[PDB]
Amino acid sequence: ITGTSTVGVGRGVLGDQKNINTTYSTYYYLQDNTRGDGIFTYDAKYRTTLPGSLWADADNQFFASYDAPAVDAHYYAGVTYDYYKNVHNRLSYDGNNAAIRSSVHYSQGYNNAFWNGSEMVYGDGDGQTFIPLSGGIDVVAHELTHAVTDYTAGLIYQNESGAINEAISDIFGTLVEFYANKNPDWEIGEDVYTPGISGDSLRSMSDPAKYGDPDHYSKRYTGTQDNGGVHINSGIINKAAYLISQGGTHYGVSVVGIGRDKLGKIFYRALTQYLTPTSNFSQLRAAAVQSATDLYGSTSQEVASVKQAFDAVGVK
Amino acid sequence: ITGTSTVGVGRGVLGDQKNINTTYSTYYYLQDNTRGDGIFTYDAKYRTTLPGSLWADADNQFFASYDAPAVDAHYYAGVTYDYYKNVHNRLSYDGNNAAIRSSVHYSQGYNNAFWNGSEMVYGDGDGQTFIPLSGGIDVVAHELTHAVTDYTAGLIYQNESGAINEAISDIFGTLVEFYANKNPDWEIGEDVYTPGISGDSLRSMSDPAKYGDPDHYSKRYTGTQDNGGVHINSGIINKAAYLISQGGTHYGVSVVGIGRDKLGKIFYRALTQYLTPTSNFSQLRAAAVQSATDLYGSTSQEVASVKQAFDAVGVK
Ligand SMILES: [Ca+2]
Ligand SMILES: [Ca+2]
Numbered sequence: 300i301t302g303t304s305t306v307g308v309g310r311g312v313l314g315d316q317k318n319i320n321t322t323y324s325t326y327y328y329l330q331d332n333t334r335g336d337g338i339f340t341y342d343a344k345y346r347t348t349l350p351g352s353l354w355a356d357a358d359n360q361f362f363a364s365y366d367a368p369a370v371d372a373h374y375y376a377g378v379t380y381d382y383y384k385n386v387h388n389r390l391s392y393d394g395n396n397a398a399i400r401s402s403v404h405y406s407q408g409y410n411n412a413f414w415n416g417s418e419m420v421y422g423d424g425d426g427q428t429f430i431p432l433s434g435g436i437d438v439v440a441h442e443l444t445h446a447v448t449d450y451t452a453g454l455i456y457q458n459e460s461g462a463i464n465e466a467i468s469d470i471f472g473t474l475v476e477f478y479a480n481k482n483p484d485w486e487i488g489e490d491v492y493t494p495g496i497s498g499d500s501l502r503s504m505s506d507p508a509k510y511g512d513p514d515h516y517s518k519r520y521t522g523t524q525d526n527g528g529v530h531i532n533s534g535i536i537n538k539a540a541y542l543i544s545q546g547g548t549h550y551g552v553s554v555v556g557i558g559r560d561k562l563g564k565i566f567y568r569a570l571t572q573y574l575t576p577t578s579n580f581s582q583l584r585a586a587a588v589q590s591a592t593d594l595y596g597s598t599s600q601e602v603a604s605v606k607q608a609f610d611a612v613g614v615k
Numbered sequence: 616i617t618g619t620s621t622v623g624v625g626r627g628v629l630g631d632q633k634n635i636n637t638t639y640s641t642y643y644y645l646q647d648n649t650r651g652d653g654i655f656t657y658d659a660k661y662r663t664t665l666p667g668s669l670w671a672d673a674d675n676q677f678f679a680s681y682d683a684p685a686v687d688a689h690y691y692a693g694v695t696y697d698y699y700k701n702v703h704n705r706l707s708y709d710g711n712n713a714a715i716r717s718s719v720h721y722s723q724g725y726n727n728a729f730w731n732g733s734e735m736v737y738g739d740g741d742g743q744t745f746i747p748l749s750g751g752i753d754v755v756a757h758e759l760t761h762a763v764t765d766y767t768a769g770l771i772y773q774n775e776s777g778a779i780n781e782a783i784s785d786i787f788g789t790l791v792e793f794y795a796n797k798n799p800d801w802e803i804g805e806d807v808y809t810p811g812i813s814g815d816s817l818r819s820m821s822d823p824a825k826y827g828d829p830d831h832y833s834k835r836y837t838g839t840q841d842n843g844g845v846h847i848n849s850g851i852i853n854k855a856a857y858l859i860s861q862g863g864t865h866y867g868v869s870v871v872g873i874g875r876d877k878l879g880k881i882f883y884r885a886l887t888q889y890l891t892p893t894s895n896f897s898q899l900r901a902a903a904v905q906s907a908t909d910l911y912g913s914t915s916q917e918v919a920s921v922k923q924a925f926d927a928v929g930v931k
């Protein structure tokens with residue numbers, strides 16, 4: 300819409316109050332004109348037709364419980380855009396300030412959220428397994444990172460390349476959660492998963508086996524479910540990335556951590572310069588080593604820690 | 616695009632030559648201005664970003680092997696629009712002549728095709744399990760019927776309502792295949808599935824158990840895979856619809872067939888007037904009986920055959 304840029308206030312899914320960028324033109328819309336070509340949030344009104352209607356509000360205050368998922372989708376797309384711009388100098392997901400669109404209230408009792416190739420879609424959850432999925436900043440950033448991957452490496456969504464695609468989304472989702480300093484951790488989806496159980500999450504990067512996912516290449520899933528294990532086999536790369544960052548000893552192999560910032564620079568470089576649509580785990584290892592070499596020198600500690608981490612999860 | 620409407624010629628996936636509606640404006644585009652607000656076909660160029668580029672061609676002749684999937688997506692969306700308009704008086708999927716958009720060459724070796732809530736997406740297959748999926752008119756019509764369902768009943772995509780949603784798509788996909796008189800049958804996907812094996816298909820409506828899907832409510836799948844069995848449990852409704860149309864005796868129960876035309880009028884009415892997002896199989900049976908009653912009278916043979924068919928598959 301064409302209108303005047305302004306700032307409204309609301310409450311997110313977890314009850315926290317935040318300011319959000321809106322646009323006024325008769326109604327106040329969730330349209331943020333301060334980032335790129337804009338961030339737009341739509342109401343899918345419990346249907347599956349997309350994108351739905353651009354979210355319109357009469358008084359620029361979003362404290363209704365129906366508003367909550369929209370406030371967080373809109374705000375956490377802004378935080379994720381800021382992370383990529385400020386940290387990696389990337390303007391939106393295509394590198395050219397493409398508009399970011401999200402729809403909330405998709406379907407009824409839908410326990411998922413996804414990037415569909417053109418926009419973000421968030422279910423409200425069934426209220427038992429999940430609450431509205433845009434309340435999790437790592438979920439929002441995980442999904443928006445699939446848009447980045449689609450425009451750069453183009454990793455296909457199955458077998459080892461799909462597992463890399465999922466891991467890259469977990470890694471950057473977690474780095475955005477640390478960037479916003481929102482009670483950060485190495486788990487995925489813990490703010491919106493099972494409201495009735497404390498302490499769990501959908502997946503763990505620090506210990507993937509907690510939830511039964513593999514933490515070593517010898518335990519990888521080889522069947523056909525889950526598009527050849529894209530959500531399952533991503534545990535192997537998540538654990539490598541946690542070790543590169545944090546260090547540790549894993550199956551016998553000791554890794555010195557180099558921190559989150561360098562982890563993010565190495566993987567971002569590997570993703571935008573060396574990975575291709577059919578890259579497998581062994582070519583991820585080569586790409587990460589080459590990236591760390593480009594950035595820090597072939598005899599750095601950074602290169603040595605990337606090698607040790609992939610050796611620790613059995614990826615040669 | 617704005618340009619002059621014209622007609623081009625090409626070859627589809629199976630090698631058949633057909634005329635297609637195009638638009639000229641420097642290049643010839645796959646843009647059909649003769650149906651509703653238009654039918655538009657895009658090239659996703661082996662990526663997953665959608666919709667891709669509107670398909671442009673220099674000389675209005677589409678005989679290259681890269682063109683084939685586009686010719687058939689474009690042409691078979693036109694046939695499906697014509698079926699719904701001519702048979703059911705429905706203008707496009709929203710009933711208001713919404714533009715129909717499709718992208719072909721999505722990803723690499725992708726063995727599927729789907730309606731994503733805003734447009735059709737077709738993989739090229741891996742060449743072993745499938746060939747480009749827009750070569751199957753029942754696949755194209757199956758997916759475009761999810762758009763109709765989304766705008767009318769709004770059946771959620773899981774458990775029994777998702778199974779109904781899938782069956783409704785198989786039924787109408789099959790009726791469009793009979794309307795175009797394209798070697799018609801009651802199987803789904805046989806023109807594009809496994810190029811190396813003759814005679815098989817993805818699913819069968821006349822005998823779902825051929826491929827292991829249930830043909831009776833007592834054999835339904837009750838686990839969590841496939842969103843609670845939406846592609847598996849649709850066999851129960853597919854068999855009922857085949858019996859209503861064709862007649863037969865099934866587990867003890869005899870059904871007099873009333874034909875395809877009445878099958879289509881009954882289910883179309885049930886879908887647009889009585890089903891809701893959470894309808895289950897028993898409420899489908901009530902909706903189909905009420906529809907047949909509205910159309911033919913409570914003491915017709917048509918009402919009696921709908922009851923016998925649902926009784927034959929164990930749905931009360
Ligand atoms: Ca308000
Ligand atoms: Ca956290």
Ligand SMILES: [Ca+2]
Nearest residue numbers: 437486487488
């Ligand atoms: Ca987290």
Ligand SMILES: [Ca+2]
Nearest residue numbers: 492493494496
């Ligand atoms: Ca929990």
Ligand SMILES: [Ca+2]
Nearest residue numbers: 672674676677
């Ligand atoms: Ca040509």
Ligand SMILES: [Ca+2]
Nearest residue numbers: 797798799800
């Ligand atoms: Ca056929």
Ligand SMILES: [Ca+2]
Nearest residue numbers: 753802803804
């Ligand atoms: Ca068929």
Ligand SMILES: [Ca+2]
Nearest residue numbers: 808809810812
């Ligand atoms: Ca075959």
Ligand SMILES: [Zn+2]
Nearest residue numbers: 441445465468
């Ligand atoms: Zn993902």
Ligand SMILES: [Zn+2]
Nearest residue numbers: 757761781784
């Ligand atoms: Zn379907």
